Design a protein around this motif. Structure first.
Motif, PDB file in Angstrom:
ATOM      1  N   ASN A  63       4.556   2.745  10.042  1.00  0.00           N
ATOM      2  CA  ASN A  63       4.282   3.689   9.145  1.00  0.00           C
ATOM      3  C   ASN A  63       4.916   4.846   8.962  1.00  0.00           C
ATOM      4  O   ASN A  63       5.305   5.399   7.720  1.00  0.00           O
ATOM      5  CB  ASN A  63       2.686   3.956   9.407  1.00  0.00           C
ATOM      6  CG  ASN A  63       1.587   3.052   9.144  1.00  0.00           C
ATOM      7  OD1 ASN A  63       1.687   2.222   8.430  1.00  0.00           O
ATOM      8  ND2 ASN A  63       0.604   2.978  10.190  1.00  0.00           N
ATOM      9  N   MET A  71       7.950   3.796   6.585  1.00  0.00           N
ATOM     10  CA  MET A  71       7.453   3.776   5.347  1.00  0.00           C
ATOM     11  C   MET A  71       7.800   4.962   4.534  1.00  0.00           C
ATOM     12  O   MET A  71       7.845   4.784   3.353  1.00  0.00           O
ATOM     13  CB  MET A  71       5.977   3.124   5.186  1.00  0.00           C
ATOM     14  CG  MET A  71       5.837   1.702   5.152  1.00  0.00           C
ATOM     15  SD  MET A  71       6.108   0.881   3.518  1.00  0.00           S
ATOM     16  CE  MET A  71       4.749   1.499   2.402  1.00  0.00           C
ATOM     17  N   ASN A  72       7.570   6.133   5.366  1.00  0.00           N
ATOM     18  CA  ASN A  72       8.013   7.553   5.040  1.00  0.00           C
ATOM     19  C   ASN A  72       9.411   7.832   4.908  1.00  0.00           C
ATOM     20  O   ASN A  72       9.872   8.248   4.108  1.00  0.00           O
ATOM     21  CB  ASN A  72       6.854   8.276   5.443  1.00  0.00           C
ATOM     22  CG  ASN A  72       5.528   8.560   4.699  1.00  0.00           C
ATOM     23  OD1 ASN A  72       5.878   8.288   3.447  1.00  0.00           O
ATOM     24  ND2 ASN A  72       4.458   8.838   5.251  1.00  0.00           N
ATOM     25  N   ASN A  85       6.927  12.483   1.132  1.00  0.00           N
ATOM     26  CA  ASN A  85       7.054  11.226   2.069  1.00  0.00           C
ATOM     27  C   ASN A  85       8.217  11.415   3.260  1.00  0.00           C
ATOM     28  O   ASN A  85       8.013  11.170   4.188  1.00  0.00           O
ATOM     29  CB  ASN A  85       7.150   9.940   1.410  1.00  0.00           C
ATOM     30  CG  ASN A  85       5.405   9.843   0.482  1.00  0.00           C
ATOM     31  OD1 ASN A  85       4.597  10.658   1.040  1.00  0.00           O
ATOM     32  ND2 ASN A  85       5.539   9.068  -0.345  1.00  0.00           N
ATOM     33  N   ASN A 124      10.076  -1.596  -0.431  1.00  0.00           N
ATOM     34  CA  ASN A 124       9.487  -0.933   0.832  1.00  0.00           C
ATOM     35  C   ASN A 124      10.160  -2.009   2.021  1.00  0.00           C
ATOM     36  O   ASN A 124      10.492  -1.467   3.047  1.00  0.00           O
ATOM     37  CB  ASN A 124       8.111  -0.985   0.914  1.00  0.00           C
ATOM     38  CG  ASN A 124       7.476   0.145   0.101  1.00  0.00           C
ATOM     39  OD1 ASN A 124       6.159   0.077  -0.158  1.00  0.00           O
ATOM     40  ND2 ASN A 124       8.109   1.174  -0.069  1.00  0.00           N
ATOM     41  N   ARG A 181      11.970   4.098  -2.347  1.00  0.00           N
ATOM     42  CA  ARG A 181      10.932   4.231  -3.450  1.00  0.00           C
ATOM     43  C   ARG A 181      11.298   5.100  -4.460  1.00  0.00           C
ATOM     44  O   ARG A 181      11.119   5.054  -5.689  1.00  0.00           O
ATOM     45  CB  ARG A 181       9.551   4.448  -3.115  1.00  0.00           C
ATOM     46  CG  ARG A 181       8.986   3.527  -2.331  1.00  0.00           C
ATOM     47  CD  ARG A 181       7.326   3.701  -1.801  1.00  0.00           C
ATOM     48  NE  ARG A 181       7.442   5.064  -1.027  1.00  0.00           N
ATOM     49  CZ  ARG A 181       7.366   4.975   0.155  1.00  0.00           C
ATOM     50  NH1 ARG A 181       7.443   3.727   0.896  1.00  0.00           N
ATOM     51  NH2 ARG A 181       7.439   6.192   0.902  1.00  0.00           N
ATOM     52  N   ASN A 199       0.914  -1.272  -0.161  1.00  0.00           N
ATOM     53  CA  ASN A 199      -0.025  -0.034  -0.021  1.00  0.00           C
ATOM     54  C   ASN A 199       0.875   1.331  -0.035  1.00  0.00           C
ATOM     55  O   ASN A 199       2.067   1.091   0.305  1.00  0.00           O
ATOM     56  CB  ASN A 199      -0.971   0.109   1.178  1.00  0.00           C
ATOM     57  CG  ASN A 199      -2.235  -0.593   0.880  1.00  0.00           C
ATOM     58  OD1 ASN A 199      -2.967  -0.254   0.051  1.00  0.00           O
ATOM     59  ND2 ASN A 199      -2.524  -1.633   1.870  1.00  0.00           N
ATOM     60  N   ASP A 200       0.221   2.431  -0.254  1.00  0.00           N
ATOM     61  CA  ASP A 200       0.825   3.543  -0.205  1.00  0.00           C
ATOM     62  C   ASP A 200       1.223   3.918   1.306  1.00  0.00           C
ATOM     63  O   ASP A 200       0.571   3.129   2.232  1.00  0.00           O
ATOM     64  CB  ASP A 200      -0.084   4.759  -0.741  1.00  0.00           C
ATOM     65  CG  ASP A 200      -0.387   4.806  -2.229  1.00  0.00           C
ATOM     66  OD1 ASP A 200       0.407   4.168  -2.918  1.00  0.00           O
ATOM     67  OD2 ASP A 200      -1.156   5.524  -2.769  1.00  0.00           O
ATOM     68  N   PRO A 201       2.170   4.886   1.699  1.00  0.00           N
ATOM     69  CA  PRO A 201       2.475   4.970   2.914  1.00  0.00           C
ATOM     70  C   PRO A 201       1.242   5.629   3.688  1.00  0.00           C
ATOM     71  O   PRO A 201       0.633   6.359   3.182  1.00  0.00           O
ATOM     72  CB  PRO A 201       3.559   5.974   3.211  1.00  0.00           C
ATOM     73  CG  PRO A 201       3.458   6.670   1.810  1.00  0.00           C
ATOM     74  CD  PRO A 201       3.023   5.421   0.753  1.00  0.00           C
ATOM     75  N   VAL A 202       1.040   5.047   5.057  1.00  0.00           N
ATOM     76  CA  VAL A 202      -0.041   5.520   5.693  1.00  0.00           C
ATOM     77  C   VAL A 202       0.214   7.152   6.236  1.00  0.00           C
ATOM     78  O   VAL A 202       1.174   7.158   6.906  1.00  0.00           O
ATOM     79  CB  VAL A 202      -0.514   4.796   6.732  1.00  0.00           C
ATOM     80  CG1 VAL A 202      -1.487   5.453   7.573  1.00  0.00           C
ATOM     81  CG2 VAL A 202      -1.042   3.480   6.298  1.00  0.00           C
TER      82      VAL A 202
END
Ligand SMILES: O=P(O)(O)C(O)(Cn1ccnc1)P(=O)(O)O
Ligand SMILES: O=P(O)(O)C(O)(Cn1ccnc1)P(=O)(O)O
Ligand SMILES: [Mg+2]
Ligand SMILES: [Mg+2]
Ligand SMILES: [Mg+2]
Ligand SMILES: [Mg+2]
Lengths: 283, 296
Positions: B166, B169-170, B139, B197, B177, A12-15
């Motif tokens: 989360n 992830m950013n 991000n 990721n 990415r 998924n896209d980052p939350v």
């Protein structure tokens, strides 16, 4: 089960939530506590909606640039209120300021979808942000490496064409590229120089003067240093350098430098005169 | 009139910038270039290229862009984390000062942005490359923003493992990415985004883990000094709260907020994660499990 949860995460896209957005925006909203664009729009006539976006862009760049400028100049106040970095800390403030630069960058693709024009809009935005940073970098270097380099008036002027002229040109160039209708760039450049020299002048003139504490090579200081050097007034030249290097908050010492500028070099009147001339060029 | 003439020439020309000027303000950046690690980041791009098949030409510019963004983000990160050392060397901000380092790093983000347009002359593609660049730098800043807020306003928010993930992830996934998406977008030749990721998450949790494990074995455990809600720390804080270990929970928060460099205090905190919350084994295990998701 751990794998399941990880699998869903990476696919998924980052939350990012609304609440996360608010935490991150705190340093920015704090500095929040246009007619120039309208007026200029009388020559450019961008439709109102487009003009709203351009304006939103300008506010983001402008506000973020001040958030960082205050960390760079160790400023305790902005418009009479405590600066964001002292409330939220330098880390969050840098990050939030930088984030808004990129948020401002995203608003650019909403100004148009015409592929030729969009490339131009991004090149304008990129070129002038590069210029803001070059000018800011030279202003900071001169100050932090003082007395290694004493700028001349001409060097100061080029620094300003970048440090202040950049965002003025960024706003103007976007409007001229988006305009349906001579370039007003030379005029906005002149506006930028007047705005900055007056900023430097007023900072001292109203002291009755954070630039002194900051140790910045302002327009009056640049004149004073070069005037004392030219007249071989060694002791006065060195005394000005000594006070700026003090990074002092002491009003008595600040007043002392203001007097060297008032009585020895007449840099304030000299600067007053310089501004009046720039302004007359327009009148 | 001589003044008005000079003023007239100034405002009717591009601003004057010299190579001497350029060198003078590139100091903070040139300093971090001495740090090694480039080859590996290049190896990643090369290995990835075996799938993407970008011509060497273009791959070179992709790499320059990635290097500028990576080094610039580390210059800022060290200011944000109050870091004294980076790759066994004194940090740029301690040498040139925070103002020049922030300005230079940000200047380099815009120089990287400028290189994007050397990747193609085709308007459609250019637009997608700039969007990728823009999205992933947005991000990066969202992730850094949370890592920094959680840490500096602790104990206002105690992140859960999910929230930590989360944020990673950013914070880290963003540049992983960015590199892959520019490449996938450029490829003349399934998306590897999910893979990259996972790579970023393994990368971050391992960076968090080694930071404590190397100090416990021999490192500086500077993440304790920084106060970072690392993967091991997030587990310990949630484990203690859940198990009712009020004193331990509070002592963990107290040591993070001291921003201490005392080695014994840092080691006391690490042995709490070792024996009391077993956050180290939990992490080693969590890492091994993510690595098997790829190997299997
Ligand atoms: O004096 P500065 O150049 O820092 C300033 O004018 C901000 N600035 C930054 C770039 N151009 C102008 P301010 O006096 O608002 O702090
Ligand atoms: O621990 P951090 O997240 O600050 C780090 O991994 C850098 N970073 C910054 C964003 N993502 C990673 P480094 O340990 O190199 O200081
Ligand atoms: Mg300032
Ligand atoms: Mg400034
Ligand atoms: Mg760090
Ligand atoms: Mg960090």
């Amino acid at each position: 089960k751990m794998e399941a949860k990880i699998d869903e995460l990476i696919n998924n896209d980052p939350v990012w939530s609304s609440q996360n957005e608010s935490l991150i925006s705190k340093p920015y909203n704090h500095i929040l506590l246009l007619n120039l664009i309208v007026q200029i729009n009388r020559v450019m006539n961008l439709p109102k909606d487009q003009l709203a976006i351009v304006s939103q862009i300008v506010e983001l760049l402008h506000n973020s640039s001040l958030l960082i400028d205050d960390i760079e100049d160790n400023a305790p106040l902005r418009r009479g209120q405590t600066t964001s970095h002292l409330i939220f800390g330098v880390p969050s403030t840098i990050n939030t300021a930088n984030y808004m630069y990129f948020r401002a960058m995203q608003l650019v693709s909403q100004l148009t979808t015409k592929e030729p024009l969009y490339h131009n809009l991004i090149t304008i935005f990129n070129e002038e942000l590069i210029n803001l940073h070059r000018g800011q970098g030279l202003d900071i270097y001169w100050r932090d490496f003082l007395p290694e380099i004493i700028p001349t008036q001409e060097m100061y002027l080029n620094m300003v064409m970048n440090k202040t002229g950049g965002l003025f040109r960024l706003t103007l160039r976007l409007m001229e590229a988006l305009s349906p209708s001579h370039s007003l760039v030379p005029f906005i450049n002149l506006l930028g120089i007047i705005y900055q020299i007056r900023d430097d002048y007023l900072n001292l003139k109203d002291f009755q003067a954070e630039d002194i504490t900051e140790g910045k090579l302002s327009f009056p200081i640049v004149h004073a240093l070069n005037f004392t050097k030219t007249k071989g007034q060694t002791e006065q030249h060195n005394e000005i350098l000594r006070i700026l290097l003090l990074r002092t908050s002491d009003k008595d010492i600040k007043l002392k430098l203001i007097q060297i500028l008032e009585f020895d070099t007449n840099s304030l009147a000299y600067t007053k005169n310089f501004i009046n001339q720039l302004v007359n060029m327009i009148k």
